[PDB]
Amino acid sequence: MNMDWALFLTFLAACGAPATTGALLKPDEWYDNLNKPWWNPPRWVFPLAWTSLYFLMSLAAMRVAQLEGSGQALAFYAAQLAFNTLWTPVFFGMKRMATALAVVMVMWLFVAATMWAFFQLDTWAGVLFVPYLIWATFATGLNFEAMRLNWNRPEAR
């Protein structure tokens, strides 16, 4: 099996939905004024991470989507993407930090489930999802700290 451009571009187009949430809800002064941990990355790190992940996750899905028995893996993939799209509107749109922690935690679970199901069909597709699970872990940690350091403000859920 090889590069299937129809599949890859379909999965890449699907990443247009979360990318659109980030483009329309760029962090503002509210984000700057939030209490954040010292290990909170600078602003320019986040566009680099998600652009890379969108390409990595669509490559991996393209490989898996060509294999028999793909059904459960691709259902997991649909779930993680939808909750990925949900996160930025919850955190930066509605300003509900605690609810957003629930969202990223569910997303984390489905990312892990997708990665595992990918490993059962295609090892490289699973490997391609390893930096996504690492980054999703990191995002979960940053959501928790932001929520914790601003617990006494109404933005907590």
Add this chain to the structure above:
Amino acid sequence: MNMDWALFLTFLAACGAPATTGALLKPDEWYDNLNKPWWNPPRWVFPLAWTSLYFLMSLAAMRVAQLEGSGQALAFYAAQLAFNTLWTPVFFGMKRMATALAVVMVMWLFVAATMWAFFQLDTWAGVLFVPYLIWATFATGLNFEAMRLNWNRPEAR
């Protein structure tokens, strides 16, 4: 083909993400004061529609996820789901009616592509998506009318 509860519940859980956007962004007085066409349904119709569609689309995806060549169909399904999740944050969260029309139009394309790809593998999966395409058409019309009848308000954007 089979009744596969693991697959069905995975697709149903995936619809929790768009359902969460609806739960968190209930239409308010801003929606009430918008100019609407006469065929704009009452508020109680929309929860009925979307609950039904979540189950129909998950049953249909469950059938497709059990066949060979499902990959392109499920990639279309993933794409459609993510833009479904994106719509309500754009229209009711950010209040960008014109931008939301672009989102529902892309979602419409992927609904149609999913339904057609579903018909190539399983007729029942395709038929189950016919009420989804109809409702998405209807939703597109309501977005268009809302934007057009309120063109001179800043939310038309």
